[PDB]
Amino acid sequence: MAIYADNSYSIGNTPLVRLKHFGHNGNVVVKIEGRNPSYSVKCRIGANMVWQAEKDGTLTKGKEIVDATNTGIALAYVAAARGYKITLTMPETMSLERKRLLCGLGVNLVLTEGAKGMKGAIKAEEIVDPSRYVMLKQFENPANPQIHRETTGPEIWKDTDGKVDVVVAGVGTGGSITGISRAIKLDFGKQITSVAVEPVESPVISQTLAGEEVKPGPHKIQGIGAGFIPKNLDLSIIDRVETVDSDTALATARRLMAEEGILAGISSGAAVAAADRLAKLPEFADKLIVVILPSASERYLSTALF
Amino acid sequence: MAIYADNSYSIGNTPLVRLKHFGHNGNVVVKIEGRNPSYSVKCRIGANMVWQAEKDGTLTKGKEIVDATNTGIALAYVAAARGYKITLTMPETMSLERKRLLCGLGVNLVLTEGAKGMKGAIKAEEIVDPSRYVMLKQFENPANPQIHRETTGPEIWKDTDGKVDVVVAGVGTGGSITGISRAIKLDFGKQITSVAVEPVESPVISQTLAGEEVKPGPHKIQGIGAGFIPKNLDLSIIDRVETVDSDTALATARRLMAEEGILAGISSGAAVAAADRLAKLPEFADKLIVVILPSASERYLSTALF
Amino acid sequence: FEYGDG
Amino acid sequence: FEYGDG
Numbered sequence: 001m002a003i004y005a006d007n008s009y010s011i012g013n014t015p016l017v018r019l020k021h022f023g024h025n026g027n028v029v030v031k032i033e034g035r036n037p038s039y040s041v042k043c044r045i046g047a048n049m050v051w052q053a054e055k056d057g058t059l060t061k062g063k064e065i066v067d068a069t070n071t072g073i074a075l076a077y078v079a080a081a082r083g084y085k086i087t088l089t090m091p092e093t094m095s096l097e098r099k100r101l102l103c104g105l106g107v108n109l110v111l112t113e114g115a116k117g118m119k120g121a122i123k124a125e126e127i128v129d130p131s132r133y134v135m136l137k138q139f140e141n142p143a144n145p146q147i148h149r150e151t152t153g154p155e156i157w158k159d160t161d162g163k164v165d166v167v168v169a170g171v172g173t174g175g176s177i178t179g180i181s182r183a184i185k186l187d188f189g190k191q192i193t194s195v196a197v198e199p200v201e202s203p204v205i206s207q208t209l210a211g212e213e214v215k216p217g218p219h220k221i222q223g224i225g226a227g228f229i230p231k232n233l234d235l236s237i238i239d240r241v242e243t244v245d246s247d248t249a250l251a252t253a254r255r256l257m258a259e260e261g262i263l264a265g266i267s268s269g270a271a272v273a274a275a276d277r278l279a280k281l282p283e284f285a286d287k288l289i290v291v292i293l294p295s296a297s298e299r300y301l302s303t304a305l306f
Numbered sequence: 307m308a309i310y311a312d313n314s315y316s317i318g319n320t321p322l323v324r325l326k327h328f329g330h331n332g333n334v335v336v337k338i339e340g341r342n343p344s345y346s347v348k349c350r351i352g353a354n355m356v357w358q359a360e361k362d363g364t365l366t367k368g369k370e371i372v373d374a375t376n377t378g379i380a381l382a383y384v385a386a387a388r389g390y391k392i393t394l395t396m397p398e399t400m401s402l403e404r405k406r407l408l409c410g411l412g413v414n415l416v417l418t419e420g421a422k423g424m425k426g427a428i429k430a431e432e433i434v435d436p437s438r439y440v441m442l443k444q445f446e447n448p449a450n451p452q453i454h455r456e457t458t459g460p461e462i463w464k465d466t467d468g469k470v471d472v473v474v475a476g477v478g479t480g481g482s483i484t485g486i487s488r489a490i491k492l493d494f495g496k497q498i499t500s501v502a503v504e505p506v507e508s509p510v511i512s513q514t515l516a517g518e519e520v521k522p523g524p525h526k527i528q529g530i531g532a533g534f535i536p537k538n539l540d541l542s543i544i545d546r547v548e549t550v551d552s553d554t555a556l557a558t559a560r561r562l563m564a565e566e567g568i569l570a571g572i573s574s575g576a577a578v579a580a581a582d583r584l585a586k587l588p589e590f591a592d593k594l595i596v597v598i599l600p601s602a603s604e605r606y607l608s609t610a611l612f
Numbered sequence: 613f614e615y616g617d618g
Numbered sequence: 619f620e621y622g623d624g
């Protein structure tokens with residue numbers, strides 16, 4: 001009987017869809033993480049961070065969840081499904097529909113100033129006298145990459161029958177590309193190309209790897225470009241870094257909608273734009289490129305996407 | 307290789323989630339059709355109606371799709387994915403986010419007057435000099451119930467290991483409960499209880515079956531309560547009809563969100579409210595009740611749901 | 613007219 | 619400040 005005891009266990013098994021108007025002869029395939037319990041890739045880590053914290057006793061009945069953040073919407077539905085209280089912090093700058101959703105899920109919301117971005121959101125460590133609160137810390141909590149190592153990567157391996165050659169993923173916390181790369185490279189033993197994507201507006205991974213001045217900047221690609229290197233980004237399994245600009249990312253997401261019939265978020269367009277560039281290099285012509293589409297476009301109705 | 311050639315083939319395989327704060331000792335289970343390509347149950351019929359129309363030559367390159375309508379958003383992403391033009395009609399009264407979504411998908415939109423409702427929307431048969439246009443007619447097109455007979459019903463049978471005793475579904479076109487009931491009753495041979503749900507504001511199925519005056523009325527449960535008996539509702543496999551009021555349906559959807567962590571639409575709350583009532587009858591105590599949750603709550607951010 | 617009646 | 623820079 002495939003009946004889940006609560007919504008948190010229904011995470012993953014997202015589909016692979018071949019692109020028709022990007023890439024070269026179908027070499028670009030997308031993984032639609034929009035099709036998850038709270039409709040983003042973060043559902044996977046919202047569940048596992050809560051699960052793991054239960055497993056080692058730091059999360060118990062009567063403790064209240066805290067973190068800074070789609071991760072919020074993920075933790076909120078998990079908190080609701082499993083019966084936890086939850087306070088959150090989010091940059092004010094994020095789309096209204098994720099603001100609106102959190103309130104309906106029972107969250108104690110606390111917006112933070114947009115100019116300070118995620119660093120400002122992480123005004124959350126402030127929040128956690130302990131004993132009552134527990135902060136889950138998505139940017140460094142290893143339970144974030146390991147759910148991707150346990151489910152998302154294996155889903156990609158199985159659905160491609162081991163044929164995946166390249167994985168393209170935008171980087172926020174870095175959990176996705178880390179767990180996925182570790183699974184396919186270390187668990188399944190295949191030397192793929194792991195491609196991190198970041199905004200050209202805030203290319204801190206590129207600058208770091210080049211031994212250059214780290215200069216983050218503001219951008220419109222919600223989800224990625226934290227402005228620093230997160231602990232949950234394993235630089236050692238990253239083979240390549242692609243940068244993408246906001247306008248192109250937006251245009252690409254619109255194209256996914258109107259030309260492919262795929263309802264994808266802003267960061268999904270960035271990831272595909274990056275993948276499309278690699279896919280049109282002759283060196284990648286015989287390569288199957290798998291691209292993570294982290295979220296769905298209805299969570300961006302209030303944004304420059306529409 | 308589980309890679310879909312376009313987004314239309316990725317329909318279905320939606321999850322079953324056990325409810326914790328409804329029913330009696332876990333006898334209520336929900337099927338989350340929010341987890342579909344365009345995030346509603348209608349994805350299934352958007353795909354199959356287009357597929358079937360291709361298969362018998364009425365839909366060809368250069369023909370333009372028409373119908374009246376979530377079905378719109380379903381046909382739109384399929385039209386985009388497979389390369390068809392599409393005009394639609396929808397009652398003005400429907401949520402802004404489904405209006406907004408259609409435009410981004412490439413649709414030629416035409417809103418109709420709310421007081422006239424769906425009948426008014428079906429100002430669409432108007433639209434189809436033929437030869438160019440083809441109307442798919444979801445309220446009578448048999449390809450609507452048969453995709454539910456081919457996928458949704460079998461998904462329910464398999465995931466419950468044949469243990470499903472009751473299926474609760476709201477009725478719009480009637481395609482869902484018809485195909486599902488036919489599958490489980492005729493294909494798998496199990497005499498379940500098929501429960502149609504309609505608004506108490508517009509109980510035309512109840513009135514018809516009672517041989518009483520059919521008096522439809524206005525209501526807030528988007529998706530169901532067309533105000534007439536659709537051809538795609540097979541009355542012969544309907545064992546029971548439950549009515550639910552708008553306020554209770556809204557309250558139930560909010561509860562699903564805040565207490566179960568399930569992001570469900572307005573009609574999903576109606577279906578669960580009906581199921582909950584049956585589930586608390588001693589005659590249904592040893593019965594596994596499966597409830598269709600047709601859509602997801604972010605498509606209702608502009609509604610009385612929020 | 614909410615539904616609407618049609 | 620769009621991103622934001624943090």
Ligand SMILES: C=C(/N=C/c1c(COP(=O)(O)O)cnc(C)c1O)C(=O)O
Pocket residue numbers: 040042068069070071072170171172173174175176177222223224265267268294295
């Ligand atoms: C950091 C989170 N978002 C992750 C994310 C990402 C990046 O995924 P990883 O964190 O696993 O790198 C990409 N695109 C979108 C829309 C995302 O929400 C958050 O919701 O706070």
Ligand SMILES: C=C(/N=C/c1c(COP(=O)(O)O)cnc(C)c1O)C(=O)O
Pocket residue numbers: 346348374375376377378476477478479480481482483528529530571573574600601
């Ligand atoms: C008639 C359509 N909707 C079907 C529907 C239904 C009813 O499903 P069936 O048409 O299969 O009966 C229930 N709830 C929601 C939200 C729905 O969108 C339409 O989108 O026009």
Ligand SMILES: CC(=O)OC[C@H](N)C(=O)O
Pocket residue numbers: 069070071094118171172173222223224225226227
């Ligand atoms: C969705 C949100 O803004 O969070 C994304 C991620 N925390 C980041 O670096 O922005």
Ligand SMILES: CC(=O)OC[C@H](N)C(=O)O
Pocket residue numbers: 375376377400424477478479528529530531532533
């Ligand atoms: C979502 C929409 O309004 O359509 C639902 C269905 N056509 C009905 O009877 O209302």
